[PDB]
Amino acid sequence: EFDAIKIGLASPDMIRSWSFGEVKKPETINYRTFKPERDGLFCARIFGPVKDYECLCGKYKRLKHRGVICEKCGVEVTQTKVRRDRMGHIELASPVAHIWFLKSLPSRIGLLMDMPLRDIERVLYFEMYVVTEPGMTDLERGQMLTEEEYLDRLEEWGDEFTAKMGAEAIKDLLASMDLPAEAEQMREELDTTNSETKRKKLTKRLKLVEAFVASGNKPEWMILTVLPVLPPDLRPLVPLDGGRFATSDLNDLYRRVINRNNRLKRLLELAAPDIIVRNEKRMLQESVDALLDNGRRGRAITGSNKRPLKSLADMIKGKQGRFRQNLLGKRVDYSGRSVITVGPYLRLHQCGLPKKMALELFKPFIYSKLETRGLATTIKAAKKMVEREEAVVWDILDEVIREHPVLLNRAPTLHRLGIQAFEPVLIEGKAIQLHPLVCAAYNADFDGDQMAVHVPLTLEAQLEARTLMMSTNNILSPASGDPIIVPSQDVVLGLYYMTREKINAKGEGMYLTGPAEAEKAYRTKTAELHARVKVRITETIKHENGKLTTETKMIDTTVGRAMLWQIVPKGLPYSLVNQKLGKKQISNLLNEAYRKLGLKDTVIFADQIMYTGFAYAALSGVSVGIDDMVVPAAKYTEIAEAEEEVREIQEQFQSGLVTAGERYNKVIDIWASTNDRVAKAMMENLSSEQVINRQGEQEKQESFNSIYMMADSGARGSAAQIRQLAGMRGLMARPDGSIIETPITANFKEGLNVLQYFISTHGARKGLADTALKTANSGYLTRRLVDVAQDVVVTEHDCGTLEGVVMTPHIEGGDVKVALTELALGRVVSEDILKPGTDEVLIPRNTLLDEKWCKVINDNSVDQIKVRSVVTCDSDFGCCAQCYGRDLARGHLVNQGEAVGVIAAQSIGEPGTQLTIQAKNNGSVKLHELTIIDEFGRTKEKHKLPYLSKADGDAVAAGETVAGGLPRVADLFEARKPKEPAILAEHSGTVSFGKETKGKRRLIITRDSGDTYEEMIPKHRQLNVFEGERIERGDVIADGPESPHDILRLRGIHAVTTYIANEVQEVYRLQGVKINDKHIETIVRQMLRKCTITFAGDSEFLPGETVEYSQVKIANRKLVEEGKEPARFERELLGITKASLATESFISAASFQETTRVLTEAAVSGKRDDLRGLKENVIVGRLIPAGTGFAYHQDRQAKRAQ
Amino acid sequence: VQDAVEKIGNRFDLVLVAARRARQMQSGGKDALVPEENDKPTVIALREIEEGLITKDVLDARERQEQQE
Amino acid sequence: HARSTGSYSLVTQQPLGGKAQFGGQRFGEMEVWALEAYGAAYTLQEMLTVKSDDVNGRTKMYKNIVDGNHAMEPGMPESFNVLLKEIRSLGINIELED
DNA sequence: GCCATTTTCGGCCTCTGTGAAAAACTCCCAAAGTTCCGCTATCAGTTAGTAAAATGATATAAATCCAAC
DNA sequence: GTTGGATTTATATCATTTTACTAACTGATAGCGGAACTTTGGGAGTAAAAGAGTCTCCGCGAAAATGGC
Ligand SMILES: [Mg+2]
Ligand SMILES: [Zn+2]
Ligand SMILES: [Zn+2]
């Protein structure tokens, strides 16, 4: 129907064209008949009939008289809905300036005729005069003339000059302007001037003027003469209950405007004194400003409820505005909500739906089937049977539900696994039964959480739910690729208890033919579940090439592992089960099952793991008791010794040997070592036991305590919680952050006294308050990230570029933090990977790194590899498949046309709630910086080189010495300059000293061309350079934190990309969160969209402005093919907030935030939004250019190419 | 739907083809190329795609044949 | 709580909110983000237009489902028309081109 | 280049219901509203009538067939 | 073997029942228009003199975009 949305200024002719009539009087409805009166705010002639196909006077009161206007009443007989589309207008007695065009800084009326806003507003509130037509006088345009000064001017000239006052004066000043010649005045003035402030103001005003000339808008339209009036149902006046009425504040604002305009017309008729007319015009301006944007021009007008009125702007903007409350998030039909319980009998693709919800949601489908099988003759009969809850309705429901997926959602939806499609199984009760294995994806636990239920209707929606949104297809985390269906809690406890080893158990040493024999033995109460036996295991290995090699050997194991081998699918080793299985071991089982078997085997295996774990956790009888917390006998002795030593240091403070701070920092260490020793003693006592073997000897065994098993299995619990259970609670922090000297020496088993409980509450309250504020901040950060990265879609398969990013293992000292295999898993190479010390092409170009090539790259020991990145992608819009690489949630290469930016934003923002020279390796050493390389090509250690046991190439053996996370992530993503930026060397050259002028220090750099560039340096800076030394570009001048801007300016794109990537990944990795670097790279690519032109070249760009980088690529490519000289640019780094408000489309920018200035700029410049993004297509209600809707848009583009 | 995505290659194109075939069966009245086994048109279309009888090219050729007729 | 079709709001022409009013669940910003991440263009279009505010669309979809078609002809959301009228009331010419 | 005042934001679901100040009378005239009555149009309800069509009953003509001579 | 009366088919005409289309009476009911009357709705007017506003509130912070020098 439509392809774009234009925005511009509304001329009075256009406003009159929109309107169906003129509103003249402020009356709304009659107080007796409750009927619209004539020419009022609800007039039936202007806006349309109140009742469908009727009229006010009742003369034409049926459909036969459509399109016929009554002579008695003037109302066109049509539907009532036309009242939500018909507009009106008010002919203002005097022109009124637009409030947005005047106080949306910068003012576009002040900056179009070169006059300050104080002067302009002095003219609008009718305080001074301004000359329009100087004529043949000494005055010029825009001169202030005070009232008395204007009397003198009238005395000595009189009729020669016109010096008007008010909005009319602004209107005819803008009338007298000639934009072409005035822009040429800019053009000739810019070259002559030298000051930077004047030049910047001049180019701002030139940009505005050129926008006016290009858009076709006239400055005359800047000031309103005809005021449009909104349709009445958009500002309804309706009877709530029993004669009480509900209205909208727009009615009050329009009533004020109409009343004051009528008063102005009456005053003009009566030839009133000038003061009264002037005051009336002032109130007309105030009322129109309050109608358009209340609370901006002055004090907000308040209603009878002592609350400010809501204007047009206040309801097109804000969180509670139209955009974010009704156009991006909508209440929907065919929806339900209920408490969630646990269904341990369900499968991954099944969810338990109550029959009441199924009956209410699937009602039209039930009607359809009842009519098609003829049980109900018509819809009324079908409704009667459905309401009566007849027997056959349930069979019809179980036939409609049979293969119809349903979408389950939980609030908040932090990532895309928060909405999933399931096949419904109909159940009694009122609670939704959820499969346990998906709870971790929902962050859902059954203490009262509720979930929402959505029924897709069209065939395309059902196919999308079954193919993309099924829980079976969603088993890998899109953030990292790790499985998300890993078992937890009861399953892990059961599998751990089943896979444990007990010494001298019943049936030890028996020989078993296989897993079935072991099951038979345990069911017959012959061999205990933890009895060591020898079992004949048949085992199939599925090699990387597809070889299926079967083998059969006798393995020493337990009965439990033999049974668990029954559910393990063929193709996996027995070494994956022949060990005690904690959370990590089961996660590895699922990971390897997915890697070597696929998805179907993995989902069946996950289900069977869940059932086996539940069954054996039930049969185990794990119970927590009061004798399970074994408090060590060494705790009391350690407390006594700590008290004695604290008293010793207490009688040593009076000796003056120590200070108060030293006493504090020594008592803290005394107690913080007593705590560690008590914890270690408790762990040693709790994790071991002494048993009697078959021979009769006393042998040490790992303990079977309930709390120890809970902690060691990884089900739920950790060492710190045990230490607070049976050891010492420890030192605590005061509400200011200080640590109380006397710790809590009692645990929860023996209880605390009053003071200890008070101190504990001091920290509990902080934890809760910080959780709440953390949730708020993480939500805001995720929203900003989505709004910056919403336009990144994989649009091509290959951009045909040669650039890439190098990657090496991450080293932060003498140990590896993360290997190259983890970094490069799933990234397409950029250049051929040569064998170390050889010209052999081990890995060719344009290959995707799976686990097979990861094993290859680990075995052949290569350190640095070049791979493609999203930041280096050359795609004009979005990215290409090869530069992104592997889709983490699918395991294969990224498909064409999926939103990778939204995935990146969700992956980065989801873990926000969780966010708070000795030599050891043999090898050689080298200088780069300092590196220590092992025997192979891997560089094991990396250390900085300050301004020396061994020289370069000297072999070194072991032991030979040479000698607020979330605020940080937000700070990095908004590119905030640090408090004390570290100065960098702008140009390569020799340092030379200048003159220490008053205030601060100066330096100079001498370039290779003889240029002397002056550098401003604060006095407190600890300079790290010496005169006579040639420093390189980007070298550190003063030590300190580095802003991303100067890294981008003086080092490059790759440098800033790496800087942001690892300085966000350090925050994530410190907390234990795994996020792939492609997401941060995508955000960085969106953060580097802008460039400033420096050389005009043969392009039309004027140097000194910001433009999008893709536009410059297109222009430069065209100019190169034409042969004319290209354009030269500088690439700029913008924060995730500025970049979003600087998008080409104004609808997305308006929907994000800062609506007033976005709309003002768009209207003044006359922009066109081509609807080429996710958010604009969501707002307008058409298919998004991503996923299933990608190809469709492509065809439209093809239809727009021809 | 692993077999379907293996035969097609792209999930979105598979969804498009399956939706078109399901609409043809539900509205036009085309018979299922595979045994129904009491299945909805969506699952029937997915099974037909997995078997290898229904692709985008096959649907386009069949539509061209119908238009010629 | 459960709902298929009930009462609608006066201005937004969107389903109500709350069990007491027999309202519908809210499909907020993050749900839209999740469907965009999945790639469900058609499910998103259906939840935006037919289920919420496309006045002719929801009636046509109900009739089609009763007939047994399970096909939709989506239209313009009503909230966008409200937005266009509100922007025009501020003296700003916003329009759709062909 | 640097203060210094404005402007702009601050997580998702679910319930929820608001009355709560504020001070004049008086006279004259025109139009809308209420009510009553009469005329007119419009239709249900019923009966009876007249010409014609439809249908059945009877009449008139042969086929042939079967029994008796 | 036969043949002629009779006992059935074959074709046509007549009578009875119903349909299709008139008019007249009956009885009501709604709708429109006019005359009179009561109610509502708008306007003008008031002659000690009376001759400068509210408005409670005012428990927000960090960052960035704007003038002014
Ligand atoms: Mg909970
Ligand atoms: Zn009328
Ligand atoms: Zn690329």
Coordinates of N, CA and C in Angstrom, one line a residue, chain A residues 19-162:
Chain A
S19 N -9.2 19.3 6.9 CA -10.3 19.5 7.8 C -11.6 19.4 6.9
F20 N -12.7 18.8 7.6 CA -14.0 18.8 7.0 C -14.9 19.9 7.4
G21 N -14.4 20.8 8.2 CA -15.1 22.0 8.7 C -14.3 22.8 9.7
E22 N -15.0 23.9 10.2 CA -14.3 24.8 11.1 C -15.1 24.7 12.4
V23 N -14.3 24.5 13.5 CA -14.9 24.5 14.8 C -14.9 26.0 15.3
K24 N -16.0 26.4 15.8 CA -16.2 27.8 16.2 C -16.5 28.1 17.6
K25 N -17.1 27.1 18.3 CA -17.6 27.4 19.7 C -17.2 26.2 20.6
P26 N -16.9 26.5 21.9 CA -16.3 25.5 22.8 C -17.3 24.5 23.4
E27 N -18.6 24.5 23.0 CA -19.6 23.6 23.6 C -19.3 22.2 23.1
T28 N -19.4 21.2 24.0 CA -19.1 19.8 23.7 C -20.4 19.0 23.4
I29 N -21.2 18.9 24.4 CA -22.5 18.1 24.3 C -23.6 18.8 25.1
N30 N -24.8 18.6 24.7 CA -25.9 19.1 25.4 C -26.2 18.4 26.8
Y31 N -26.6 19.2 27.8 CA -26.7 18.6 29.1 C -28.0 17.9 29.4
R32 N -29.0 18.0 28.5 CA -30.3 17.3 28.6 C -30.3 16.1 27.6
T33 N -30.2 16.4 26.3 CA -30.3 15.4 25.3 C -28.9 14.6 25.1
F34 N -27.8 15.1 25.6 CA -26.5 14.6 25.5 C -26.2 14.4 24.0
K35 N -26.6 15.3 23.2 CA -26.3 15.3 21.8 C -25.3 16.4 21.4
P36 N -24.5 16.1 20.4 CA -23.6 17.2 19.9 C -24.3 18.4 19.5
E37 N -23.8 19.6 19.8 CA -24.3 20.8 19.3 C -23.5 21.3 18.1
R38 N -24.0 22.4 17.5 CA -23.5 22.7 16.1 C -22.2 23.5 16.3
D39 N -21.3 23.1 15.4 CA -20.0 23.8 15.3 C -19.2 23.8 16.6
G40 N -19.5 22.8 17.5 CA -18.7 22.6 18.7 C -17.5 21.7 18.5
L41 N -17.0 21.2 19.6 CA -15.9 20.3 19.6 C -16.3 18.9 19.2
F42 N -17.6 18.6 19.3 CA -18.1 17.3 18.9 C -19.1 17.3 17.8
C43 N -19.1 18.4 17.0 CA -20.2 18.6 16.0 C -20.3 17.4 15.1
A44 N -21.6 17.1 14.8 CA -21.9 16.0 14.0 C -21.8 16.3 12.5
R45 N -21.8 17.6 12.1 CA -21.6 17.9 10.7 C -20.1 17.8 10.4
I46 N -19.2 18.3 11.2 CA -17.8 18.3 10.9 C -17.2 16.9 11.0
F47 N -17.5 16.2 12.0 CA -16.9 15.0 12.3 C -17.7 13.7 11.9
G48 N -19.0 13.8 11.9 CA -19.8 12.7 11.4 C -20.9 12.3 12.4
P49 N -21.7 11.3 12.0 CA -22.8 10.9 12.9 C -22.4 10.1 14.1
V50 N -23.2 10.2 15.2 CA -22.9 9.5 16.4 C -23.3 8.0 16.3
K51 N -24.4 7.8 15.7 CA -24.9 6.4 15.5 C -24.7 6.0 14.1
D52 N -24.6 4.7 13.9 CA -24.3 4.1 12.6 C -25.4 4.3 11.6
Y53 N -25.2 4.9 10.5 CA -26.1 5.1 9.4 C -27.4 5.8 9.9
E54 N -27.2 6.8 10.8 CA -28.3 7.6 11.2 C -27.9 9.1 11.2
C55 N -28.7 9.9 11.7 CA -28.5 11.4 11.7 C -29.0 12.0 13.0
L56 N -28.6 13.2 13.3 CA -29.0 13.8 14.6 C -30.5 14.1 14.6
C57 N -31.1 14.6 13.5 CA -32.5 14.9 13.5 C -33.4 13.7 13.3
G58 N -32.8 12.6 12.9 CA -33.6 11.4 12.7 C -34.5 11.3 11.4
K59 N -34.3 12.2 10.5 CA -35.1 12.2 9.3 C -34.6 11.1 8.3
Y60 N -33.3 10.9 8.2 CA -32.7 9.9 7.4 C -32.1 8.9 8.4
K61 N -32.7 7.8 8.6 CA -32.3 6.9 9.8 C -32.3 5.4 9.3
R62 N -31.7 5.2 8.2 CA -31.5 3.8 7.7 C -30.4 3.8 6.6
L63 N -30.0 2.6 6.3 CA -28.8 2.4 5.4 C -29.2 2.7 4.0
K64 N -30.5 2.7 3.6 CA -30.9 3.1 2.3 C -30.5 4.5 1.9
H65 N -30.3 5.4 2.9 CA -30.0 6.8 2.7 C -28.5 7.1 2.8
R66 N -27.6 6.1 2.5 CA -26.2 6.3 2.6 C -25.7 7.4 1.7
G67 N -24.7 8.2 2.2 CA -24.1 9.2 1.4 C -24.9 10.4 1.1
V68 N -26.1 10.6 1.8 CA -27.0 11.7 1.6 C -27.0 12.6 2.8
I69 N -26.7 13.9 2.6 CA -26.6 14.8 3.7 C -28.0 15.4 4.0
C70 N -28.4 15.4 5.2 CA -29.6 16.0 5.6 C -29.6 17.5 5.4
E71 N -30.7 18.0 4.9 CA -30.8 19.5 4.9 C -31.1 20.1 6.2
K72 N -31.8 19.3 7.1 CA -32.2 19.8 8.4 C -31.0 19.9 9.3
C73 N -30.2 18.8 9.3 CA -29.1 18.7 10.3 C -27.7 18.8 9.7
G74 N -27.6 18.5 8.4 CA -26.3 18.6 7.7 C -25.3 17.5 8.0
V75 N -25.8 16.4 8.6 CA -25.0 15.3 9.0 C -25.0 14.2 7.8
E76 N -23.9 13.9 7.3 CA -23.8 12.8 6.3 C -24.1 11.5 7.0
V77 N -25.0 10.7 6.4 CA -25.4 9.4 7.0 C -24.3 8.4 6.6
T78 N -23.5 7.9 7.6 CA -22.4 7.0 7.4 C -22.1 6.3 8.7
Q79 N -21.0 5.6 8.8 CA -20.7 4.9 10.0 C -20.1 5.9 11.1
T80 N -20.1 5.4 12.3 CA -19.6 6.3 13.4 C -18.0 6.3 13.4
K81 N -17.4 5.2 12.8 CA -16.0 5.2 12.8 C -15.3 6.3 12.0
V82 N -16.0 7.0 11.1 CA -15.5 8.1 10.4 C -15.1 9.2 11.4
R83 N -15.7 9.2 12.6 CA -15.4 10.2 13.6 C -14.0 10.0 14.2
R84 N -13.3 8.9 13.9 CA -11.9 8.7 14.3 C -10.9 9.0 13.2
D85 N -11.4 9.6 12.1 CA -10.5 10.0 11.0 C -10.8 11.4 10.5
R86 N -11.9 12.0 10.9 CA -12.2 13.3 10.4 C -11.6 14.4 11.3
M87 N -11.0 15.4 10.7 CA -10.3 16.5 11.4 C -11.1 17.8 11.2
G88 N -10.7 18.8 12.0 CA -11.2 20.1 11.9 C -10.1 21.1 11.9
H89 N -10.5 22.4 11.9 CA -9.6 23.5 12.1 C -10.2 24.7 12.8
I90 N -9.3 25.5 13.4 CA -9.6 26.7 14.0 C -8.8 27.8 13.3
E91 N -9.6 28.9 12.9 CA -8.9 30.0 12.2 C -8.5 31.0 13.3
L92 N -7.3 31.0 13.7 CA -6.8 31.9 14.8 C -6.9 33.3 14.4
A93 N -7.3 34.2 15.3 CA -7.4 35.6 15.0 C -6.0 36.2 14.7
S94 N -5.0 35.8 15.4 CA -3.6 36.2 15.2 C -2.7 35.1 15.1
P95 N -1.6 35.2 14.3 CA -0.7 34.1 14.2 C -0.1 33.7 15.6
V96 N 0.2 32.4 15.8 CA 0.8 31.9 17.0 C 2.0 31.1 16.6
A97 N 3.1 31.3 17.2 CA 4.3 30.6 16.9 C 4.3 29.1 17.5
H98 N 4.9 28.2 16.8 CA 4.9 26.8 17.2 C 5.9 26.6 18.3
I99 N 5.5 26.0 19.4 CA 6.3 25.9 20.6 C 7.5 25.0 20.3
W100 N 7.3 23.9 19.6 CA 8.4 23.0 19.3 C 9.5 23.7 18.5
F101 N 9.0 24.5 17.5 CA 10.0 25.1 16.6 C 10.7 26.3 17.3
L102 N 10.5 26.5 18.5 CA 11.0 27.7 19.3 C 11.8 27.3 20.5
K103 N 11.4 26.2 21.2 CA 12.1 25.8 22.4 C 12.6 24.4 22.3
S104 N 12.7 23.8 21.1 CA 13.4 22.5 20.9 C 14.8 22.9 20.5
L105 N 15.7 23.1 21.5 CA 17.0 23.7 21.2 C 17.8 22.8 20.3
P106 N 18.5 23.3 19.3 CA 18.5 24.8 18.9 C 17.2 25.3 18.3
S107 N 16.8 26.5 18.6 CA 15.6 27.0 18.0 C 15.8 27.3 16.5
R108 N 14.9 26.7 15.7 CA 14.9 26.8 14.3 C 14.3 28.1 13.7
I109 N 13.8 28.9 14.6 CA 13.4 30.3 14.2 C 14.5 31.3 14.5
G110 N 15.1 31.1 15.7 CA 16.3 31.9 16.0 C 17.5 31.7 15.1
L111 N 17.7 30.5 14.6 CA 18.8 30.1 13.8 C 18.6 30.2 12.3
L112 N 17.4 30.7 11.9 CA 17.1 30.8 10.5 C 17.1 32.3 10.1
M113 N 17.1 33.2 11.0 CA 17.2 34.6 10.8 C 18.3 35.3 11.7
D114 N 19.1 34.5 12.4 CA 20.2 35.0 13.2 C 19.8 36.0 14.2
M115 N 19.1 35.4 15.2 CA 18.6 36.3 16.3 C 18.4 35.4 17.6
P116 N 18.8 35.8 18.7 CA 18.8 35.0 19.9 C 17.4 34.7 20.4
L117 N 17.2 33.7 21.2 CA 15.9 33.3 21.6 C 15.4 34.2 22.7
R118 N 16.2 34.8 23.5 CA 15.8 35.9 24.4 C 15.1 37.0 23.7
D119 N 15.8 37.5 22.6 CA 15.2 38.6 21.8 C 13.9 38.1 21.2
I120 N 13.8 36.9 20.7 CA 12.7 36.4 20.0 C 11.5 36.3 20.9
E121 N 11.7 35.8 22.1 CA 10.7 35.6 23.1 C 10.3 37.0 23.7
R122 N 11.2 37.9 23.8 CA 10.8 39.3 24.1 C 9.8 39.8 23.1
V123 N 10.0 39.5 21.8 CA 9.0 39.9 20.8 C 7.7 39.1 20.9
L124 N 7.8 37.9 21.3 CA 6.5 37.1 21.3 C 5.6 37.4 22.5
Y125 N 6.2 37.6 23.7 CA 5.4 38.0 24.8 C 5.1 39.5 24.8
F126 N 5.3 40.1 23.6 CA 4.9 41.5 23.4 C 5.5 42.5 24.3
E127 N 6.9 42.5 24.3 CA 7.6 43.4 25.1 C 8.5 44.4 24.4
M128 N 8.9 44.0 23.1 CA 9.7 44.9 22.3 C 9.1 44.9 20.9
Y129 N 9.7 45.8 20.1 CA 9.3 45.8 18.7 C 10.5 45.4 17.8
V130 N 10.2 44.9 16.6 CA 11.2 44.6 15.6 C 10.8 45.1 14.2
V131 N 11.8 45.6 13.5 CA 11.6 46.3 12.2 C 11.4 45.2 11.2
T132 N 10.4 45.3 10.4 CA 10.2 44.4 9.2 C 10.8 45.1 8.0
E133 N 10.2 46.2 7.6 CA 10.6 46.9 6.4 C 11.3 48.2 6.8
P134 N 12.6 48.3 6.8 CA 13.3 49.5 7.1 C 13.0 50.6 6.1
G135 N 12.8 50.3 4.9 CA 12.6 51.3 3.9 C 13.9 52.2 3.7
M136 N 13.7 53.5 3.5 CA 14.8 54.4 3.3 C 15.0 55.1 4.7
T137 N 15.4 54.3 5.7 CA 15.7 54.8 7.0 C 17.1 54.3 7.5
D138 N 17.5 54.8 8.6 CA 18.7 54.3 9.2 C 18.6 52.9 9.8
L139 N 17.4 52.5 10.2 CA 17.3 51.2 10.9 C 17.4 50.1 9.8
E140 N 17.7 48.9 10.4 CA 17.8 47.7 9.5 C 16.9 46.6 10.1
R141 N 16.8 45.5 9.5 CA 15.9 44.4 9.9 C 16.4 43.8 11.2
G142 N 15.4 43.5 12.1 CA 15.7 42.8 13.3 C 16.1 43.7 14.5
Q143 N 16.0 45.0 14.3 CA 16.4 45.9 15.4 C 15.3 46.0 16.5
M144 N 15.8 45.9 17.7 CA 14.9 46.1 18.9 C 14.6 47.6 19.0
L145 N 13.3 47.9 19.1 CA 12.8 49.3 19.4 C 11.9 49.2 20.7
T146 N 12.4 49.7 21.8 CA 11.6 49.8 23.0 C 10.3 50.6 22.7
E147 N 9.3 50.4 23.5 CA 8.0 51.1 23.3 C 8.2 52.6 23.3
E148 N 8.9 53.2 24.3 CA 9.2 54.6 24.2 C 10.1 54.9 23.0
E149 N 11.1 54.0 22.8 CA 11.9 54.2 21.7 C 11.1 54.1 20.4
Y150 N 10.1 53.3 20.3 CA 9.3 53.2 19.2 C 8.4 54.5 19.0
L151 N 8.0 55.1 20.1 CA 7.3 56.4 20.0 C 8.2 57.4 19.4
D152 N 9.5 57.5 19.8 CA 10.4 58.5 19.2 C 10.6 58.2 17.7
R153 N 10.8 56.9 17.4 CA 11.0 56.5 16.0 C 9.8 56.9 15.2
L154 N 8.5 56.7 15.7 CA 7.3 57.2 15.0 C 7.3 58.7 14.9
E155 N 7.9 59.4 15.9 CA 8.0 60.8 15.8 C 8.8 61.3 14.6
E156 N 10.1 60.7 14.5 CA 11.0 61.4 13.5 C 10.9 60.8 12.1
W157 N 10.5 59.5 12.0 CA 10.2 59.0 10.7 C 8.6 58.9 10.4
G158 N 7.9 58.2 11.3 CA 6.5 58.0 11.1 C 6.2 56.8 10.2
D159 N 5.7 57.1 9.0 CA 5.2 56.0 8.1 C 6.2 55.4 7.2
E160 N 7.5 55.8 7.4 CA 8.5 55.3 6.5 C 8.8 53.8 6.8
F161 N 8.8 53.5 8.1 CA 9.2 52.1 8.6 C 8.0 51.4 9.2
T162 N 8.1 50.1 9.1 CA 7.2 49.2 9.8 C 7.9 48.5 10.9

